[PDB]
Each structure stands twice: as structure tokens, then as C-alpha cells.
Amino acid sequence: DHVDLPYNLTATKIDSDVFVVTDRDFYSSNVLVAKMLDGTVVIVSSPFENLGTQTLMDWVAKTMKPKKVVAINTHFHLDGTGGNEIYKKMGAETWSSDLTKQLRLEENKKDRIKAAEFYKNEDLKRRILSSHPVPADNVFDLKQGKVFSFSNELVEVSFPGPAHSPDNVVVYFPKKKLLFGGCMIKPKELGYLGDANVKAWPDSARRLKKFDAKIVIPGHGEWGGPEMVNKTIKVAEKAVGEMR
Ligand SMILES: [Cl-]
Ligand SMILES: [Cl-]
Ligand SMILES: [Zn+2]
Ligand SMILES: [Zn+2]
Ligand SMILES: [Zn+2]
Ligand SMILES: [Zn+2]
């Protein structure tokens, strides 16, 4: 089933050398952890804050003994950039699009106390206020994307268009046939609409059909197969229809 971690994280194995770690205190946010054939560990997205992320990195160190860690932010929300403080502290190489870095820096200008009020309880508010999110150390041009090659094993980061957020990117692992679609994968309901482009979302999701994926991992909730994309398109087009 799963391994129980501190701060209400759970880790589930979905393939050889591939795990999903879920932050169950903060909106059941999913984090992909994949060990490459050459020993590099790639982490996609993040827990919301420092206690969760330290917990994640302790588990990565203990169970995978990485040669090197590369962390890829999926978008500027805290499930995305909330891990950067601890990723950096633990020596990981953090990456995001230039737009994600810009949006995180702008978000940091907002009054923190007001932002923390939308959280469930006092314990979570205190944890959020005890972390101070930072952008990634390394950036790529959003529309160009980024391809890593770890001893000829590729990891492809690409922008399919605005959907859940203006900056959402997906991460594809061709050898493992694994697509981390993040928070633009919404097979039942679209969720938080604040930064969304609902009109663009159907065509942005249509761009995910090209991937030869056996597993599609969403930003929240259970992962599935390529049908996760089909479902998302229908959910988004339903919302667009309701809109006029
Ligand atoms: Cl404000
Ligand atoms: Cl269909
Ligand atoms: Zn359990
Ligand atoms: Zn988000
Ligand atoms: Zn700090
Ligand atoms: Zn999310």
C-alpha cells in the first residue's frame, strides 16, 4: 500500500525506482521521486513547506542514496516551489521556468499573514509562516522547455499552454513511460480557479495526448493511465460550455 512518513506524508511505489510521495496535510499534494539508471534522483513538484520537504529529503537520502538530486518545480504554487528552501539546503539542483520564478517572487510580495488565513487550522498556519518560499536556482525559458539527459536517459520538461496556471509545466520520462501532468490534470473537477485559464485548458490538455505514457500522475489525488488526459479534456470543456 504505502509507507508512513512524518508530518502526514505517505510514499507509494508505482514502478521500479519510482515513487509518489503525498503531502496529506496540505491538499494531498503529489511529489514524484524517480531514481535514474545512473543514480541521479529526480524530484518533481514539492510538499508545501519546510517540515514536509525535510521529511521527504530525509526519506530520499535514506532509501535511494542519490548520486545527485535534481528538483523540477511544476508551477509557482507551494506544491511546486514550497520545497526549494530545503532542496537547496540539502544540496539539490533546483529548476523552474523563468515565469514560475517571476510569479513566486511576486507572490512573496503579498502580505503573508492574510495569505495564511485560508488554511485549515492553527498548526498548519504556523508551519506556513515558518517557511519562506524561494524560487529555483536555475531557470529555463518557459516556452522553450528543458530536456535533461542523465547518461542518455531523458527527462523532458515542457509547457503545453496555460491551464491550471499560466506557468504550469509537465515532466515526461520516456524510458519509464511516465508523465507528471501536475495540477492541470483534473479528471473530475477543475479545483482552484484563481490562476486558471479555463478557456485555454481543453487545448492545453489536448497537447498531453502525444505522450506514450503508461502512468499519468496528477498534482492531487490518485494517479492513473493515459485516460487521465481524456477525462481532463472533458471536465475542462464542460466548464467552458457552462461559461456561455
Ligand atoms: Cl496583499
Ligand atoms: Cl474519450
Ligand atoms: Zn498509513
Ligand atoms: Zn497549483
Ligand atoms: Zn527561509
Ligand atoms: Zn496543485
Residue numbers in the entry: 34 to 56, 58 to 63, 63Q, 64 to 209, 216 to 226, 230 to 253, 256 to 267, 296 to 316
Task: Show passages lifted from the paper.
The São Paulo MBL (SPM‐1) is widely distributed in South America, Europe and North America, in the Gram‐negative pathogen Pseudomonas aeruginosa. Like other B1 MBLs (NDM, VIM and IMP),10 SPM‐1 has a binuclear zinc center, but has loop characteristics of the B2 MBLs, suggesting it is a B1/B2 hybrid, which, consequently, may be challenging to inhibit. SPM‐1, like other B1 MBLs, has a di‐zinc ion active site with one zinc ion bound at a (normally tetrahedral) tri‐histidine site (Zn1) and one in a trigonal bipyramidal site (Zn2) comprised of conserved Asp, Cys, and His residues. SPM‐1 is distinguished from other B1 MBLs in possessing a “wall” of hydrophobic residues involving Phe57 and Tyr58 on its L3 loop, Phe79 on the loop connecting α5 and α1, and Phe151 and Tyr152 on the kinked α3 helix in the “closed” form, as well as Tyr228 on the opposite side of the active site cleft.
SPM‐1 crystallized in its di‐zinc “closed” form,10a in which the α3 region folds over the active site, and in a previously unreported space group (P4222). The resolution extended to 1.7 Å for uncomplexed crystals and 2.38 Å for inhibitor soaked crystals.
